[PDB]
Amino acid sequence: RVPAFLSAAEVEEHLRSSSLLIPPLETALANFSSGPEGGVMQPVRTVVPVTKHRGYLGVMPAYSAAEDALTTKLVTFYEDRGITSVVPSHQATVLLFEPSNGTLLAVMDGNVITAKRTAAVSAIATKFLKPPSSEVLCILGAGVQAYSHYEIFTEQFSFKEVRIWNRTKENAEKFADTVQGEVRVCSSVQEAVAGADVIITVTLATEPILFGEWVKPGAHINAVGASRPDWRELDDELMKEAVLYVDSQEAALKESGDVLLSGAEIFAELGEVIKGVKPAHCEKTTVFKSLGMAVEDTVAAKLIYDSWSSG
Amino acid sequence: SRVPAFLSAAEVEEHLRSSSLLIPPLETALANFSSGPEGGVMQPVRTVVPVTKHRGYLGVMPAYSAAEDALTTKLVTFYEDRGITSVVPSHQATVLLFEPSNGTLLAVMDGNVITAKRTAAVSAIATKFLKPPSSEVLCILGAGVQAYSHYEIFTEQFSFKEVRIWNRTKENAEKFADTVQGEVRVCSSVQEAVAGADVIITVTLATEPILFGEWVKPGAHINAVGASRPDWRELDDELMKEAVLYVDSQEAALKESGDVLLSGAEIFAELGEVIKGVKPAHCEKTTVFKSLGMAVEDTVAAKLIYDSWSSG
């Protein structure tokens, strides 16, 4: 018995659509937030800073009884060293084990899983915290997460207008050119968020790039970047003013610079909202701080492995 | 990007073969780990995911060591004992090695042999530092994977006039004595096994104390390898209370060692500290080395083998 290897291509083929991840993900998020009865054993992510290379190794193990899946995702991301750069990308790989045996069943690309699963979770949050009538969508960033998010948002919702802003203008244009559907390339984040109902922040910025003073009251913001406790994408007033929702409180309190450096108070976990124990103040300016959780990779890894296994 | 290389258990055995050769690089790693930040080792405490409905555990052990510039993560799975029903093997491990600068997963390799040898080597290091000044009788409690690896390196590293073994299941202690090279006295009770023993090795999956201080010869050195969970024990309160306690990692012991926690024993020092000389080795006193296993120990191993492998 040797572990099977699933290429990125083989994964894209058994996952195929991230909008299909929504249901199993809503379940996982709810189960994760329903404490022990939820069946998910997820310790907070551990990060190993590889300081001499300005990078980080993240390990995300999880067991979920509901679908009886035992996995662990390992990720590596290296700091932006400035605009002309040249940095190595986010890299992930997921390992799936036999829950009863402990045998390593498969090692698979985690890049597409990470792309698709993060976008799906943001979509779930948006479908819950998005305000009454919700016309304009704004995306800050133009990397892997930008595309995955755009893909599922245009599929799951209907925006009269979609905007994008990127520190490097040429990439925001490349984005608008390669994506299906029209997108307005903006030259400043304040122009991009001007009157925006839903905003998505997926950058590698360490200092605030979105200031609450530019945000339209009641807008929902998916804060996906800044997964270190000394990095920020949002301002103190945005963090101050808005009703804060996260995927995991323990994770936020350990990894979100935006939550920590601002001293904002966590209102609830997305899982709580999904199940109904916490209210969705979608009429108020909301912020969903996403850090990523092991169980989210578990449900995906599982789905894929079964699909793969079927042949 | 690169497709990760896969190293089978057999290929690991081929590129890694006398656990004795791991001793030097391991002493370095242990010293570096205990020399704080200057040591270059970034090792957060092991995280364990209990897989409750299967009575098992998933352990993740990531680490970066600048000295040898290696970035790895070992993933382990072990299931509580059940007797004959126990799953087989009880421990499964796999190590992943990454390119420290780009983050690319260079290789996924069997971790079973690494775990077996790495652990035995570390216990050997502790024993070589901690053992009484006339150490003649060796006693092993247990007869599984760790018992063999420990036996192998202890016989090669040290000179005992006598070696003893005790195992809950007598038939396996006998199978052990018959399979191993060199003579071993199979004992019918732990108390008989440790009677007058200078160095003791406990490598069982017991959750309740099996070794009581009352049977221990004053000055004996004990390598406490099992009971890696914070509600498992192998040693009793008297042994834990009267002995000078040494561990591999304080943070790890205070989080995972039931023996340390349930007894409320006070950690005297880290093995890394004594290796470097910052802490004393009270080898004339009854000592206990609580081993939990550390990621960096798998790091140095994984690296050594990956280099040998990509060479020839």
Ligand SMILES: NC(=O)C1=CN([C@@H]2O[C@H](COP(=O)(O)OP(=O)(O)OC[C@H]3O[C@@H](n4cnc5c(N)ncnc54)[C@@H](OP(=O)(O)O)[C@@H]3O)[C@@H](O)[C@H]2O)C=CC1
């Ligand atoms: N410190 C570290 O770096 C590491 C520690 N370990 C630990 O070392 C231990 C042994 O590992 P390994 O040899 O691979 O596992 P094995 O499955 O090979 O263990 C076999 C041993 O378990 C013993 N045993 C099980 N239950 C009991 C019991 N309740 N009381 C008396 N003895 C019992 C004996 O079982 P039986 O009666 O059926 O023969 C047998 O000798 C475990 O605690 C393991 O987690 C492992 C790796 C590293």
Ligand SMILES: NC(=O)C1=CN([C@@H]2O[C@H](COP(=O)(O)OP(=O)(O)OC[C@H]3O[C@@H](n4cnc5c(N)ncnc54)[C@@H](OP(=O)(O)O)[C@@H]3O)[C@H](O)[C@@H]2O)C=CC1
């Ligand atoms: N919530 C979660 O589960 C997850 C959160 N994350 C987070 O999402 C983010 C984006 O990830 P991903 O898209 O995969 O990574 P990418 O490498 O694809 O990020 C590209 C983006 O980084 C932006 N960026 C980089 N540096 C700066 C800067 N300092 N300030 C302004 N923007 C900058 C833009 O760079 P440029 O101008 O050079 O094009 C570009 O839009 C964070 O980096 C982070 O890892 C990631 C995965 C999951």
